[PDB]
Every structure is written in structure tokens, then in C-alpha cells.
Design a protein around this ligand. Structure first.
Ligand SMILES: COc1ccc2c(c1)N(CCCNC(=O)c1cccc3c1N[C@H](C)C(=O)N3)CCC2
Length: 116
């Protein structure tokens, strides 16, 4: 509390991120930052004001950018909400997002209870 040590956040939270990365096929669109021109979705940043992806979250854990664990939870949820905002409900990314949210819910609960 209330600025947690970065090494403690990394040790506690990284397994929850790893759980997301282990999901195949579902994590694949989330593993790298979105590049709208290269992917042919040029309106992406117009709609998605705060992009987020698994590699960025990992980098933030690795580099001590979270002061407290709810900031990490908020970035994971930002990633999910961006995908549900941008994509149509029939798309792979939308359905994959929903699966990741299921996995994350299960993983994050006991970890947050342990951190305070
Ligand atoms: C597009 O669905 C898939 C599904 C599986 C795979 C791939 C792509 N690919 C491509 C992965 C790169 N393309 C995207 O990442 C992406 C593309 C269009 C829309 C969106 C994209 N992602 C962002 C997060 C979004 O919200 N909409 C690899 C094989 C597995």
C-alpha cells in the first residue's frame, strides 16, 4: 500500500497477464499494439482514444509504471472495452475479447484479494 513496490506488483500480477497470453486463438489480436494503417482500419484511433494491448501492459509491469494494482486492472479492462467498442458483435476480435474477459475475471480475483 498505497504505492506498492513495482517488483511486488510484477510478481503478483504477471501470472494474470500470462493467463491472457496463453489463450489461443483468442489472445492473438491483442498481443501487439494496433497499427491502423497496416491493418486496414484507418478510423481506429478516431474511435479508440486510448489504445491498449497485452505487450504495452507487460512493458508497464516490467518498467514499474503502475503505482497500485487497480491501475493494471483498469488497463486490462480498457483493452477489453476498446475491442467491444470498435468491433461488431459477430467479429472474431469481439468474441475473443469476451473469452479473455472470462479468463481474466477468474485469475484476477484472488490476486487482488491478496494485494489489498
Ligand atoms: C481480426 O481477428 C483476428 C483473429 C485472429 C487472428 C488475427 C486477426 N490475426 C491478425 C492480427 C492483427 N490484426 C488485428 O489485431 C485486428 C484486425 C482487424 C480489426 C481489429 C484487430 N485487432 C484490434 C485489437 C481490434 O480491435 N480490431 C493474426 C492471426 C490470428
Amino acid at each position: 500500500k498505497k504505492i506498492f513496490k513495482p517488483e511486488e506488483l510484477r510478481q503478483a500480477l504477471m501470472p494474470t497477464l500470462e493467463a491472457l497470453y496463453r489463450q489461443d486463438p483468442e489472445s492473438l489480436p491483442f498481443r501487439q499494439p494496433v497499427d491502423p494503417q497496416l491493418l486496414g482500419i484507418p478510423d481506429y484511433f478516431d474511435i479508440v482514444k486510448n489504445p491498449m494491448d497485452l505487450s504495452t501492459i507487460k512493458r508497464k509491469l516490467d518498467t514499474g509504471q503502475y503505482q497500485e494494482p487497480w491501475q493494471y486492472v483498469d488497463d486490462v479492462w480498457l483493452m477489453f472495452n476498446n475491442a467491444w467498442l470498435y468491433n461488431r458483435k459477430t467479429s472474431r476480435v469481439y468474441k475473443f475479447c469476451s473469452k479473455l474477459a472470462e479468463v481474466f475475471e477468474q485469475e484476477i480475483d484472488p490476486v487482488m484479494q491478496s494485494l489489498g
